[PDB]
A paper describes a structure:
Tetrazoles were among the most promising almost isosteric replacements for the fatty-acid carboxylate group. Their calculated pKa values are about 3.8, in the same range as those for fatty acids.
Residue numbers in the entry: 2 to 131
The structure:
């Protein structure tokens, strides 16, 4: 859709604070905050795949909209994830240990805009086509 492609991180706001809320420790936050990952999004039938590639860490999730799945996050959390399409926005919720975080991926102009919320912390990451 508007989401399919290869997307390179070009900007990030409040990622260190978000990682802190995720319980990521200092040395790991340092490494994560300088990463400039590629995000490759593809769709085949029901199944959407989101691949993250960086020198620090690669991740991949494949999923069906509305169908909860198990995910190991980049920072090694074991979470229950559910992703839906809401007014053109991919909305992801991860739930683990009575906590949750929400990740919204939207297409705005040339950009893929990713908004991550946990507790009072909102991080916004902007990716552009590679
Ligand atoms: C939480 C998180 C972490 C945690 C982490 C920190 C430090 C070391 C290892 C993990 N790391 C990454 C890197 C840079 C490492 C891939 C991401 C990420 N994925 N796509 N773009 N950025 C996210 C992330 C960002 C937005 C949406 C979903 C996940």
């Amino acid at each position: 859709d508007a989401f399919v492609g290869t997307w390179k991180l070009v900007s990030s706001e409040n990622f260190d604070d978000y990682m802190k809320e995720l319980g990521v420790g200092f040395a790991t936050r340092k490494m994560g905050g300088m990463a400039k990952p590629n995000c490759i999004i593809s769709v085949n039938g029901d199944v959407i795949t989101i691949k993250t590639e960086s020198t620090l860490k690669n991740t991949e999730i494949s999923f069906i909209l509305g169908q909860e799945f198990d995910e190991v996050t980049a920072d090694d959390r074991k979470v229950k994830s559910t992703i839906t399409l809401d007014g053109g926005v991919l909305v992801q919720v991860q739930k683990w240990d009575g906590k949750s975080t929400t990740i919204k991926r939207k297409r705005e102009d040339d950009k893929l805009v990713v908004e991550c919320v946990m507790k009072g912390v909102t991080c916004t990451r902007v990716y552009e086509r590679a």
